[PDB]
Design a binder for this molecule. Structure first.
Ligand SMILES: [Ca+2]
Ligand SMILES: [Ca+2]
Ligand SMILES: [Ca+2]
Length: 327
DNA sequence: CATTAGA
DNA sequence: TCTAATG
């Protein structure tokens, strides 16, 4: 957590690069297990050799660890960090829509900058167009203070369209979070679950709503169960307009909410931890359900859930307010 | 790890 | 169809 720190972060930097600047899927995957194992080790790595006794730890990496240990740096690290192309990729990446594949492609064509990107907006897909357009705003954080105003509207239309709807704003938001990155809306309706073969319109109806009134401003992606967009809070009585914010709405079988809700609300650890417990408690938790374990090794049979509570009760735990679902 | 775009 | 990009 800190004794192993530079090794780990060096290693991660090492990994990140192969994966993006190169297409080194393996080397990449290589550095990460290492970076993983070396993280678990309870002592200070004092030398490659030492490290080396580790799993996933090869000659390659060990060599690297010595260099970093010996001198507070790493050339390859120093060189990459320096490398304009490689830089280039890392950057283009921040554009929502742009991934490695495209980063590389773009570069190879000579588009390495924001402006580069603009000049050739034709070279770009709708997603990336939008991304490009909302670059600043997209990178910006969402103050709760706003999360609050937004969740409000959202609940409002939800309700106006059909009163039978159930929306939830999951995420760190739902967990208190002074600020969030984007909003996560989980959606369900009684008239949609497991088998009741859809009602795409269910998703549809509400997106249309949100737009109708101006909350929705762009569509990044719209499908029958998962909508991904751009939104904005009515820029008041002028002098102050709101930044463009990513938002995502998703249809869910009414019979699958709470588990999903539980789940998306995290935190990553709270999850893991609660989950770990459901195992002892003779259960299995996953994004959609909860199944009783059968000694044979495994088992099935989805236990019915009407609330975040059922899931708790099940595993005989203390209801944890989202506030304190931190870990 | 599943959904969407797109070509 | 596959492949990429988001979460
Ligand atoms: Ca070894
Ligand atoms: Ca990106
Ligand atoms: Ca999110």
């Amino acid at each position: 957590e800190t004794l192993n720190g530079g090794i780990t972060d060096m290693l991660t930097e090492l990994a990140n690069f192969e994966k993006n600047v190169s297409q080194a899927i393996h080397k990449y995957n290589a550095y990460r297990k290492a970076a993983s194992v070396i993280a678990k080790y309870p002592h200070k790595i004092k030398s490659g050799a030492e490290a080396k006794k580790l799993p996933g730890v090869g000659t390659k990496i060990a060599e690297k660890i010595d260099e970093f240990l010996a001198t507070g740096k790493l050339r390859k690290l120093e060189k990459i960090r320096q490398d304009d192309t490689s830089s280039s990729i890392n950057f283009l990446t921040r554009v929502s829509g742009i991934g490695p594949s495209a980063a590389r492609k773009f570069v190879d064509e000579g588009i390495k900058t924001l402006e580069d990107l603009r000049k050739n907006e034709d070279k770009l897909n709708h997603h990336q167009r939008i991304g490009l357009k909302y670059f600043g705003d997209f990178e910006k954080r969402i103050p709760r203070e706003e999360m609050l105003q937004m969740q409000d509207i959202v609940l409002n239309e939800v309700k106006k369209v059909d009163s039978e709807y159930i929306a939830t704003v999951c995420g760190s938001f739902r967990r208190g979070a002074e600020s969030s990155g984007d909003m996560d809306v989980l959606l369900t309706h009684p008239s949609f679950t497991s088998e009741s073969t859809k009602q795409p319109k269910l998703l549809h109806q509400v997106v249309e709503q949100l737009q109708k009134v101006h909350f929705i401003t762009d569509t990044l992606s719209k499908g029958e169960t998962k909508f991904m967009g751009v939104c904005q809070l009515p820029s008041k009585n002028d002098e102050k307009e709101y930044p463009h914010r990513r938002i995502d709405i998703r249809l869910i079988p009414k019979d699958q909410y709470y588990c999903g809700v539980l789940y998306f609300t995290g935190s990553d650890i709270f999850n893991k931890n609660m989950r770990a417990h459901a195992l002892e408690k003779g259960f299995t938790i996953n994004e959609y359900t909860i199944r009783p374990l059968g000694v044979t090794g495994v088992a099935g049979e989805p236990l019915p859930v009407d609330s975040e509570k059922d899931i708790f009760d099940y595993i005989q735990w203390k209801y944890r307010e989202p506030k304190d679902r931190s870990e």
